[PDB]
Subunit: 298 residues, 3 copies
Amino acid sequence: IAAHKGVNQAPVPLKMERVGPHDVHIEMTAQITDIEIDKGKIYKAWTFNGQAPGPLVVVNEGDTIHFTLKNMDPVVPHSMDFHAVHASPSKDFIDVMPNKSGTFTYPANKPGVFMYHCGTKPVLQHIANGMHGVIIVKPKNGYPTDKEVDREYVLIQNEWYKYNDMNDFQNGVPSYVVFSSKALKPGDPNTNGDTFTLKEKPLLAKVGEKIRLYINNVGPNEVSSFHVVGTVFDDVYLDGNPNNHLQGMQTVMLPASGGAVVEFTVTRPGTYPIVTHQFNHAQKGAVAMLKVTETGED
Amino acid sequence: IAAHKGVNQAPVPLKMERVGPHDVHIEMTAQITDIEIDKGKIYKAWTFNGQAPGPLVVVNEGDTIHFTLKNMDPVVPHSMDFHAVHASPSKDFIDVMPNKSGTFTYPANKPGVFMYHCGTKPVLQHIANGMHGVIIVKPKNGYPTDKEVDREYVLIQNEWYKYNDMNDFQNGVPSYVVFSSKALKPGDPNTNGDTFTLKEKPLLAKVGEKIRLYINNVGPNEVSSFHVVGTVFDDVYLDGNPNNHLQGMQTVMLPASGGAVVEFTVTRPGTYPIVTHQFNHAQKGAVAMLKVTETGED
Amino acid sequence: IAAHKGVNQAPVPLKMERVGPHDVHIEMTAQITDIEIDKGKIYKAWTFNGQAPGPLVVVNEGDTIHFTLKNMDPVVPHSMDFHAVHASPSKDFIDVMPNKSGTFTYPANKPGVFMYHCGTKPVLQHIANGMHGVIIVKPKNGYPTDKEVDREYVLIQNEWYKYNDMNDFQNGVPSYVVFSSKALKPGDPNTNGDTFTLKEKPLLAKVGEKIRLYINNVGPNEVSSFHVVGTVFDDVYLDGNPNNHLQGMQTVMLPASGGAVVEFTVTRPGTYPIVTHQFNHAQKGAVAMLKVTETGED
Ligand SMILES: [Cu+2]
Ligand SMILES: [Cu+2]
Ligand SMILES: [Cu+2]
Ligand SMILES: [Cu+2]
Ligand SMILES: [Cu+2]
Ligand SMILES: [Cu+2]
Ligand SMILES: [Cu+2]
Ligand SMILES: [Cu+2]
Ligand SMILES: [Cu+2]
């Protein structure tokens, strides 16, 4: 796209504020930002807020979101679809033109770990170029295992293809498949989907802890066989809904856009890889590390 | 196949009649019929009754089916395998020669949304050329959410490949991935697997309704990440068995031949896309629309 | 690999002995062994004990395993990762050099049907060359349906690619997808992953029996849509954990490394194919047979 040549819009923080006991304002951008998805490989991504996947959004069950998208792309329209919400797609996930803003309001009445993404046709093109992310909706009565959990993180799996190549998006194998982590609390890492950062800077934990991961595989195209090496998931809540309870899973199957809450114990010090067990994808990037130390610090 | 050149056998209605409180006769054909699977693209499909996927069959839990296949293909044998039934495959899903009929009897003792398909070797070839469909077996005690449901439809996902090309069937990406709808009640649409009909003629619903979809992904080869844009599934019954209950799913993972009953609320007027969230497949056809109006009519 | 030219190390039996009420010794080899994966097609596999998938391991919930790997490969390191165990991957699933042995100890505290595999980088390469298998951990209180089960077998699904070809492993479709059976009791078959043995020598059962299969899809790369023709699964326990109970499934979706216990009734004499319903994979080998006779014998 000629109007994207040389464009690299610096990342802009997510803006979010609570405006009532059940109402929350969120402001995001759509912007074009260079991201290093593998060493030496820059992808001029289509993004929310200069991150791909985009920034994490966390709301409470029953919150209505009053969402604004500011479209900083000079030529391509963008839009936002949160899988958390009940909305009219043709009214509420509509396009925002370049250099304009649009505001939409919709409720999040279901707990869980939901994908969000751009909804502009062709949606494959907008998702594959980087316009995906996760919104977590926290359950009003929590999860039955909340009191067991010592530490938590968010992980997202996505693919990257040949740059803005619709033939490859529809017909080709992914060039890279990658994990990123998005921060829940100050001091947590906040990374983009790349083949290396969570290997070189593992997530941290302490010996004996029960870890909860909020996970989503945003695709665009693959499913995920999510596994933490050296442990078994004690409890799994499919899509993060507390009712969809499984126990003792070695691997969690996630559809494209599928989410889960998974919990597992790390019994011994060491580094624990986190993979999709579709090992062609692991080989193409989708391995993150969890470093477990006697103190929980590096 | 030289004997299929120029053959286009007009569709023949499904014949079905109840012959006892727990016994039902069904008569289907195997026939060769041109179907427009994308605009300008005709596939000379191998079909049941001139439809691909084939006609919907609905029976009650505990019904024994006395099934007749009339093979109208001039040269290729065909057969029928219902995933609903308990049967001896080597006795009861055997081949019926060209211009012959065969009758088989077997019970449907499990509720759910089951694939049926031709079972003639190579089964990949017979399924990929179009010989797939769905049989629904209604549960004797219903589903716990029956009283919440306002409106229901049947959707089936399938792929189409290069015509009768066994190399492509085994080794190639699908050319098209498509939804069709099969009628439950008079006035419901009854369509074939194509990239366009359920976009141009959306399924209809009314604002505020709880919709139930009986879904199956018949493949042949892909899995499906089934999602309705702008809602969340309130309840999901995997394979349509009432015991396999999930709640609050954003997306339902279906294996090849996998079925489900899914239910969800449409809160606002508008058009709601229905996709597999494997977006390479959505892009290649697998998007249907649900138009939600204040009255439920167009 | 020049040092593998002409190498064909005869299979070595698994050695296992109980050394306390909750402790079990296991000794395996890593060795390079020719296996006929399709008629006329020899794959010089990387294996445990000269079998691919490797030998079956069965322990009880709560057993600690004291595992020794003897590496008979003349040049490549190997290692062992059991998905059953809680262990430190960087201490306990480490490499054993050629012509050396290594011993690791770790507990199996979760019931189910777990994949095991070599954990040496690149793990895709070691899994795809044949270093995968299953460990079953039997639940302390059994499964609720144990008393209904007449006969049981173990089935494993895997893929084979072009020989030791990392490009094909990461980017190519599988050349073959295959089932094997591993013996639970004397007289049960014990086979390797090939396109033909369980067609030519079906598993046996008797009319009217309830069959339990312990299944795992070890990949490396594909997911599996597991189906037995002519029946419906009465009960399914995902990953073999008794709590993850489903009923009346036509097809069980397994992630890569995913396991299950499935149970189903065979009502009539005949031969019952067992497939992944991803029919491109079935066509490339993944069909096993179950021959059901009036006596249970051939
Ligand atoms: Cu507001
Ligand atoms: Cu966009
Ligand atoms: Cu593993
Ligand atoms: Cu009759
Ligand atoms: Cu046929
Ligand atoms: Cu979506
Ligand atoms: Cu010992
Ligand atoms: Cu190895
Ligand atoms: Cu089938």
